[model samples]
Target: SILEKITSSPSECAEHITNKDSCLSKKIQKELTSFLQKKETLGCDSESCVITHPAVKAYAQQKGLDLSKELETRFKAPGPRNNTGLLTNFNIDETLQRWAIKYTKFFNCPFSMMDFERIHYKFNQVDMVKVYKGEELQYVEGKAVKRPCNTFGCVLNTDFSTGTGKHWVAIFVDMRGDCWSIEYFNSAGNSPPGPVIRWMERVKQQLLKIHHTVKTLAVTNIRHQRSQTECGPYSLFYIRARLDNVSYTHFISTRITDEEMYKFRTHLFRIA
Candidate 1:
């Protein structure tokens, strides 16, 4: 009935409802327009954010942008999404070890059949692959593991497997009811490659840049939001854009109402 009602033209549906004042089509059109505008604005803002970078600023000035005031602020003041909590020091081995200990359950360890065949020549009793992916696969509770993805709404991980440096970025809500994220590359060169190895170097580079960049962006976006409306609600979107952190990703679902709510159960990713 709802689908039929929606499909019918205004003239056809006009007779079905007696209320002359009801405007379903009008409401739908308005809502659709609003959503479109929101999407467009988001794109525009993202482009603006990227452009404010030093490289972009230099280019703009070269093109004769008398952006004295704009440059002053850009050079000195913070911009959107610039605040982050990722540490500057990069320790690949420590991070991986922590991740293995923390999120063994997500990997569904004892090493799945695919994983088993991946690292070993054959199912040998003394196989190192089986040992790490098996005996060390035991999941621990109450321990913090780093995130494979980011905790924030955005990140860019390059493609190391392809050696293309083509980065992949995702902006989504993570398990912790926050935006968890990471950006690294896949250099394993084949299926089931060790994600940690592929992304270790790139992750470290991004981390150093992320802290200051994130802080500046965070402050800038906050200012932008506050300037928009007096009563708009604010949220802290978390992200950990690191490569060495090979924490497995998983969704935990809770049955609520007639449906289930899937929340991110992040290991070490958070915003506070």
Candidate 2:
């Protein structure tokens, strides 16, 4: 137990003024070296997510995946100590792109994703008079609706509420037969506002052009984020969880913490 507390640190032997190279210093170095070597053998880094550790490596592994490749791909060293690579805030477009790759690779569902740029184009800067009240118009009219590219199912990050682009949420549209529905997932702890709801209704109206009736268009809170800057990761996690068929109970019980988000950033860094 004492060995665990004793670590390989330059300051660990500061009190040993008489003998700088003391027995305690040697013991600490050996124990810490052994500990670090064990972790390294498991393909873990200080920045790696605990869930991705070798002890739980199978949990992160998809079936039939090459274990060696998986481990090699995930082990990434932390960024420079002075400059943190993981910031609390993130670029939404870049985050979405990384998520798109992971989502397509990890999930089995027939899914598609629209990035923030495409969404901005569709909702704001398309045909001038036709749709160009530009997410600011009060109500939707004929020809103002821009039907999304994918008719089956897709995820989008939208700031339909403020349009200031301050807050974004992920909207998932599912088309089944002649019926379609939407699920709104936001990490802001608030339900989709009136403007977001209205904008979604416009999207639903556009879907009607294909003769798909709206079955469900309600907003449900999937998870709550701890800090203000986690909306990006939270939205990505929500979409991935849904695609993976992860239940609400599972989501809440196994939610990623703020610390783990740094690991998430490192994971994305390796791929991106």
RMSD of each: 22.4, 17.0
Highest-scoring model, TM-score: 2
Give the alpha carbon lDDT tens digit for every residue of 1-272 in model 1: 11121111222112223333431234333433433245444343322233434554565566655433332221211211123222211211122223333233222112222112232344532222222233323322224333232222222232434544432222222122223333221112122225433333333344434332211111111111211111101111112212222222311111111001001111211111
Error of 2 at 221 (Å): 3.7
User: Per model, how many backbone clashes are there?
Assistant: 34, 0
Error of 1 at 45 (Å): 29
Model 2's lDDT to the true fold?
Answer: 0.39
Candidate 2 lDDT, 7-48, residue by residue in tens: 212221122123534312333334334444465565655323
- For model 1, the local distance difference test gives 0.25
lDDT of each: 0.25, 0.39
59: Cα error in model 2, Å? 39
